Structure 1
Amino acid sequence: MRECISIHVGQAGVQIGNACWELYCLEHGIQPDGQMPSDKTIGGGDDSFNTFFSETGAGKHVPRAVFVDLEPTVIDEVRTGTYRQLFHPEQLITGKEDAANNYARGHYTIGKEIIDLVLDRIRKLADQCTGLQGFLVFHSFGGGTGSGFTSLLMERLSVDYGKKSKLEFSIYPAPQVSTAVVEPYNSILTTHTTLEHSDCAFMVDNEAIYDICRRNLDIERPTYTNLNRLISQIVSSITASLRFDGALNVDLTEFQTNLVPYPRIHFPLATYAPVISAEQLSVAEITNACFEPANQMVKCDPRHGKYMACCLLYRGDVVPKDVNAAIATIKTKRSIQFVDWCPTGFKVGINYQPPTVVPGGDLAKVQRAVCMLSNTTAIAEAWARLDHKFDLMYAKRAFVHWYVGEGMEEGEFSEAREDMAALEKDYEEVG
């Protein structure tokens, strides 16, 4: 058994993190006070769920998590939430004043003064691991902390935990749930600085979550809570292999092996089905839905790209025979072209426990669901959209003085933008 440490940065990272651990506790039968009656070994164990939860002599199951934000109001909800009893103070780190939507304030000015502390509190969790695999890092692209401090933290982690894997769950900005007009600047700056430090990153476009919530849950004006409960189901789908018995994606290393042949192109597209508001869909139908743009975590058209890898992760009443049948049908109906230097296939994982939903939430509990992870070049459409918004503002140097005022140089902007131009280029060389 090898441990994983989850790190939540900025408002988006913290609030999504709080929703994921809630869902984890429900999935594992862990009550808000951290007890777990089904866990018959007290004060220890190397069970699969111990990859995310350590244990106390009193029987409390403690998330292997650190929450960090540069203002206190969001994390103050964790230490007073229904699951406040799970965490201890050393796990919740708050600063005085936030990054004011400014990458440079989060990376340079404020990040410099809190980074050693955050690393100490992470060191404390690492010291309790027999064999740490690495870190899962949750954050927005668009916030000053989520962008600026995350990129700083990822750098130090590569120094202090060189052999360890790092995965990202990143929120890509959408004007329909906008916080700041400079979010394109922050997104590109943090992608440039984090790119060589991240082995695999799952991007979620708030535009896609917003529309799925409006369309499939009939929510007129989705809130962050609506969004995060949907996001947490998807995150849960991705991490379930780490927390349950199984043979697919059983350590962090395996995510890279199965989804990322070319290391810079490490952004798999996630697609999830079914999303139903509170008739039961078949294996064929939920699989077919994995190839509809309307169910993707990033709106884009995979028909106009090439696949490098594809993983299907089923929860519920699913048997391999029905998956093979469904795949037979879809392949002869849909445009699914792999790159020539990869095999045209699917890795399939099935967890018999159907998805858990928060009681009273907006998601209907289903008998089967699936999350597809595909490394398709079509996700580059999201880079192109973002790089274009960057270019419009940067041509006039709009808002740049806020970043130079924090000690950043103007040349870091065009340095980061040239990297993104090379990224868009690498994606096109594959297609």
Structure 2
Amino acid sequence: VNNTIVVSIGQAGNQIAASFWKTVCLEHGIDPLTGQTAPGVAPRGNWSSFFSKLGESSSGSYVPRAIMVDLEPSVIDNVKATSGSLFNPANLISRTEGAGGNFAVGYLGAGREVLPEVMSRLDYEIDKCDNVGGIIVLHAIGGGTGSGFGALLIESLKEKYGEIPVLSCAVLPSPQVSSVVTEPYNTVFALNTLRRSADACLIFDNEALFDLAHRKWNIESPTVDDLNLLITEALAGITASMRFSGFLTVEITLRELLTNLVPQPSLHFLMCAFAPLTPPDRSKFEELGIEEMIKSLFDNGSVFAACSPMEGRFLSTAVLYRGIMEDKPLADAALAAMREKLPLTYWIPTAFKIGYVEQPGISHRKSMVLLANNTEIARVLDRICHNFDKLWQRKAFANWYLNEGMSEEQINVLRASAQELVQSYQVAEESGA
């Protein structure tokens, strides 16, 4: 089956992937603390999309196709304490110093040091794959490692392989408050890579992921244990078509997902949404039907993004149903109303790539995942382009980017290369209007 590697860069990408392989292993009926399945019985679903057979005894551990890369040791040592013998600890690479909001440490620095060791483990995974057809890099677009080495690694991987999708499932900076002081820098330095050398960059935003766990999962303080579960359940939702060969499962590979969702090579920043956002308190009589999950998919406060999705133009949309469906013609006819309700872009007549997966989610029985390639995703990056310029008219922080090896000529290119990105939806908004 189409194998797929989940590379986990940075603290924000690892702590998603700490919770992502918790989910995926529990999704395949595999113990997430040992790597071994239930004794003697096969794992449910098609395990070999993400996993690898370690030991031919049918009860041994299944090592996930996952390299966890971060320049700070405390993140993966948290994972090594909370995974046991699940991961391959040759893939759980760590360093000492860290990056610390400095792009030019993850990209050209301590991340340059790990790059001969990281790529010597992707080559270990890919040669171990049957035929790998996607690489899901989990990082943030805010830090020094996830946005630094994530910009390095993806440009070190399509440059090497190139015939493989790189879905950079990434976490944008929240606009409510910046978790890094150099966070509108580090995005624009990664928007060089995540525009040019990544086939798609699935965004997530920490503001919207707070609101979708506070107002929707009805808790007071949504921790990062639950931000990395809203993301996870979406990342374990877009990859349910990759991992399951069921009844009428529309088996969507990453390339099969991105041919439907990347219209032209500079329009591949995808948002996401999940349904139902019913809390896990067993609201059984309030479980949502398919006619009303799609009504809750496309709310303005339902996507995992700072922008307002229905205030702009949905350019390419991919609604990935996942679970027990009784109603195929009631499916796709709710989207027929949503073809009328939602702002679409003629420039495209119709775009709803609809996945079914009969294997249900862990938390949900009838779960829906959206991937709307929106034009509003430039309006998230309009904030980042503006917060860059306020920190470039002053020529902000200091030498911190410049002493590591970057130049003022290069930084103005990458601002333009993010300006070329933001205009590339502004090209596609009014022409799509």
TM-score (norm 1): 0.91
| CA pair 329-256 structure 1, distance change in 2 beyond 3 A | closer
Query: Tell me, what secondary structure is at the counterpart of 2:148?
Result: helix
> What letter matches 1:68 in structure 2?
V
Report Cα offsets for 1:207-262 as digits up to 9, x if no partner. Answer: 10011112112322221112111110011111111100165353221122111121
Q: Which residue is 1:53 aligned to?
A: 51
Say if 1:60 and 1:86, in contact at 8 Å, map to a contact too: yes
Question: In structure 1, how many angstroms separate the alpha carbons of the residues matched to 2:160 and 2:137?
Answer: 16
Q: Which residue is 2:30 aligned to?
A: 30
Report Cα offsets for 1:65-108 as digits up to 9, x if no partner. Answer: 10011011010011111x22211220100011001210012211
Question: In structure 2, how many angstroms separate the alpha carbons of the residues matched to 1:27 and 1:155?
Answer: 31
| CA pair 394-131 structure 1, distance change in 2 beyond 3 A | same
Q: Which residue is 2:78 aligned to?
A: 77
Question: In structure 2, how many angstroms separate the alpha carbons of the residues matched to 1:78 and 1:368?
Answer: 30
Question: In structure 2, how many angstroms separate the alpha carbons of the residues matched to 1:330 and 1:415?
Answer: 39
Question: In structure 1, how many angstroms separate the alpha carbons of the residues matched to 2:29 and 2:240?
Answer: 14
Deviation at 1:294, TM superposition (A): 0.6
Counting only pairs closer than 5 Å after superposition, residues 365-376 of structure 1 correspond to structure 2 as: 366-376=364-374
| CA pair 130-303 structure 1, distance change in 2 beyond 3 A | closer
Query: Tell me, what secondary structure is at the counterpart of 2:291?
Result: helix
Structure with more of its chain in strand, by fraction: 1
Say if 1:70 and 1:99, in contact at 8 Å, map to a contact too: yes
Say if 1:272 and 1:290, in contact at 8 Å, map to a contact too: yes
Report Cα offsets for 1:382-428 as digits up to 9, x if no partner. Answer: 11111111111111011042111212111222111111111221211
Deviation at 1:199, TM superposition (A): 0.6
1:280 matched to 2:280? The reply is: no
> What letter matches 2:293 in structure 1?
I
| CA pair 115-315 structure 1, distance change in 2 beyond 3 A | same
Q: Which residue is 2:296 aligned to?
A: 289
Question: In structure 1, how many angstroms separate the alpha carbons of the residues matched to 2:153 and 2:322?
Answer: 33
Counting only pairs closer than 5 Å after superposition, residues 251-266 of structure 1 correspond to structure 2 as: 251-266=253-268
Structure with more of its chain in helix, by fraction: 1
> What letter matches 2:196 in structure 1?
E
Question: In structure 2, how many angstroms separate the alpha carbons of the residues matched to 1:400 and 1:312?
Answer: 45
- Give the share of equivalent positions with the same residue, in percent: 36
Deviation at 1:177, TM superposition (A): 6.6
Say if 2:53 and 2:61, in contact at 8 Å, map to a contact too: yes
Question: In structure 1, how many angstroms separate the alpha carbons of the residues matched to 2:427 and 2:175?
Answer: 30
Report Cα offsets for 1:159-217 as digits up to 9, x if no partner. Answer: 32122221110100115574311101000001113422111111001110011112112
Say if 2:70 and 2:76, in contact at 8 Å, map to a contact too: yes
Say if 1:355 and 1:369, in contact at 8 Å, map to a contact too: yes
Greater shift in the superposed pair: 230-239 or 245-254: 245-254
Q: Which residue is 2:377 aligned to?
A: 379
Question: In structure 2, how many angstroms separate the alpha carbons of the residues matched to 1:22 and 1:302?
Answer: 30
Counting only pairs closer than 5 Å after superposition, residues 27-426 of structure 1 correspond to structure 2 as: 27-31=27-31, 32-37=33-38, 48-56=46-54, 57-58=56-57, 59-81=60-82, 83-174=83-174, 178-245=178-245, 248=250, 250-277=252-279, 278=281, 279-318=286-325, 319-332=327-340, 334-340=341-347, 342-357=348-363, 366-426=364-424
Question: In structure 2, how many angstroms separate the alpha carbons of the residues matched to 1:324 and 1:114?
Answer: 47
Question: In structure 1, how many angstroms separate the alpha carbons of the residues matched to 2:26 and 2:259?
Answer: 30
Deviation at 1:37, TM superposition (A): 3.6
> What letter matches 2:273 in structure 1?
T
| CA pair 337-3 structure 1, distance change in 2 beyond 3 A | closer
Deviation at 1:313, TM superposition (A): 1.1
Say if 1:249 and 1:255, in contact at 8 Å, map to a contact too: no
Deviation at 1:28, TM superposition (A): 0.8
> What letter matches 1:328 in structure 2?
A
Question: In structure 1, how many angstroms separate the alpha carbons of the residues matched to 2:162 and 2:336?
Answer: 42
User: What 5-or-longer segments of structure 2 have no aligned partner?
Assistant: none
| CA pair 36-372 structure 1, distance change in 2 beyond 3 A | same
Question: In structure 1, how many angstroms separate the alpha carbons of the residues matched to 2:9 and 2:374?
Answer: 27
> What letter matches 2:214 in structure 1?
R
Greater shift in the superposed pair: 245-254 or 227-236: 245-254
Say if 2:299 and 2:310, in contact at 8 Å, map to a contact too: no
| CA pair 399-39 structure 1, distance change in 2 beyond 3 A | farther
| CA pair 239-38 structure 1, distance change in 2 beyond 3 A | farther
Question: In structure 2, how many angstroms separate the alpha carbons of the residues matched to 1:200 and 1:193?
Answer: 10
Say if 1:177 and 1:206, in contact at 8 Å, map to a contact too: no
Say if 1:29 and 1:38, in contact at 8 Å, map to a contact too: no
Say if 1:314 and 1:369, in contact at 8 Å, map to a contact too: yes
| CA pair 350-130 structure 1, distance change in 2 beyond 3 A | closer
Deviation at 1:3, TM superposition (A): 1.4
Question: In structure 1, how many angstroms separate the alpha carbons of the residues matched to 2:22 and 2:376?
Answer: 33
> What letter matches 1:253 in structure 2?
R
Question: In structure 2, how many angstroms separate the alpha carbons of the residues matched to 1:174 and 1:428?
Answer: 22
Question: In structure 2, how many angstroms separate the alpha carbons of the residues matched to 1:321 and 1:39?
Answer: 40
Query: Tell me, what secondary structure is at the counterpart of 1:86?
Result: coil
Greater shift in the superposed pair: 315-324 or 187-196: 315-324
Question: In structure 1, how many angstroms separate the alpha carbons of the residues matched to 2:140 and 2:172?
Answer: 7
| CA pair 302-329 structure 1, distance change in 2 beyond 3 A | same
Say if 2:50 and 2:64, in contact at 8 Å, map to a contact too: yes
Say if 2:298 and 2:310, in contact at 8 Å, map to a contact too: no
